[PDB]
């Protein structure tokens, strides 16, 4: 049929259900259940018409389901297909088709629940740097839209509990790729860095770095989830192979932090170890060489 708008009409609730044992209620820590109110009227919609719900700042749906139904008073009236923005775009979408049940005398009011992870950053991609500015710790307004009608709700987000002054890491699964983006930010040298070496590697043979999906940059500070907010060029050299990515750098100015990220593949994306190089010399002469390993789990 035609494209309709204003089907999703209210943002009723946005509530977190810790999907693992996360220590903070962050936008990117799954799962946020977004409950939206919707209405369809057979006098103004027909089976086969379509509509789309735009979701800024949403990275993925935290379910293996590919679609969700719009059901009310026990009758299915539409089917909506999930499209996760992931690293392709800063927003996610629902694309919905009205069902044959929406015969002309039906007036349907219902709700639907969507299991979400927001994007508040994680790499130096354009998409992640854009979404690194979506939210801050504390009260935020979250807004979705159907194509005219903006529907909003306020929500409380907790900052990361990790002290931002140390080294920083991240690993986020990218479901459509079966890859994981992984980040490393050097410990903070507030007055700048004379030099340093940093990076990460496969440890036991079960991990492969994807050298075609990497970023190396300096960021002007970090957001409330310890993610880069900018990415500028600077003086470094790099080596990249499937076994690991490493940089050596010099002369990073005060107020900036160097970071490296990469997509990785693993035999089991839910259980793998990475080995990190971590050496730096702050302007002023403080130095540390402190390599380490981390065990990453999805179970």
């Amino acid at each position: 049929g035609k494209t309709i708008t204003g089907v999703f009409n209210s943002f009723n609730s946005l509530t977190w259900s810790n999907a693992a044992t996360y220590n903070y209620k962050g936008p990117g820590t799954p799962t946020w259940n977004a409950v939206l109110g919707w209405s369809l009227d057979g006098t103004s919609a027909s089976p086969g018409d379509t509509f789309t719900l735009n979701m800024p700042c949403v990275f993925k749906f935290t379910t293996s389901q590919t679609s969700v139904d719009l059901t009310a008073h026990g009758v299915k009236y539409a089917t909506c297909q999930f499209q996760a923005g992931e690293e392709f775009m800063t927003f996610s979408t629902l694309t919905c088709t009205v069902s044959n049940t929406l015969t002309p005398s039906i007036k349907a009011l219902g709700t639907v629940t969507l299991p979400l992870a927001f994007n508040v950053g994680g790499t130096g991609s354009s998409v992640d740097l854009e979404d690194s500015k979506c939210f801050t710790a504390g009260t935020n307004t979250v807004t979705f839209n159907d194509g005219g009608k903006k529907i909003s709700i306020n929500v409380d987000f907790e900052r990361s509990n990790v002290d931002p002054k140390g080294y920083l890491t991240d690993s986020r699964v990218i479901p459509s790729l079966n890859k994981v983006s992984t980040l490393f930010v050097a410990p903070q040298c507030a007055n700048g860095y004379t030099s340093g070496t940093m990076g990460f590697a496969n440890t036991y043979g079960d991990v492969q770095i994807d050298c075609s999906n990497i970023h190396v940059g300096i960021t002007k500070g970090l957001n409330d989830w310890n993610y880069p907010v900018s990415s500028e060029s600077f003086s470094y050299t790099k080596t990249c192979s499937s076994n690991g990515i490493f940089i050596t750098y010099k002369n990073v100015p005060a107020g900036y932090r160097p970071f490296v990220d990469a997509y990785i593949s693993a035999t089991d994306v839910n259980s793998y170890t990475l080995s990190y190089a971590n050496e730096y010399t702050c302007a002023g002469g403080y130095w540390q060489r402190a390599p380490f390993t981390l065990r990453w789990t999805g179970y």
Partner: peptide, 7 residues
């Protein structure tokens, strides 16, 4: 074991 959970 000390681990970090992915997202």
């Amino acid at each position: 074991t000390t681990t970090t959970t992915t997202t």
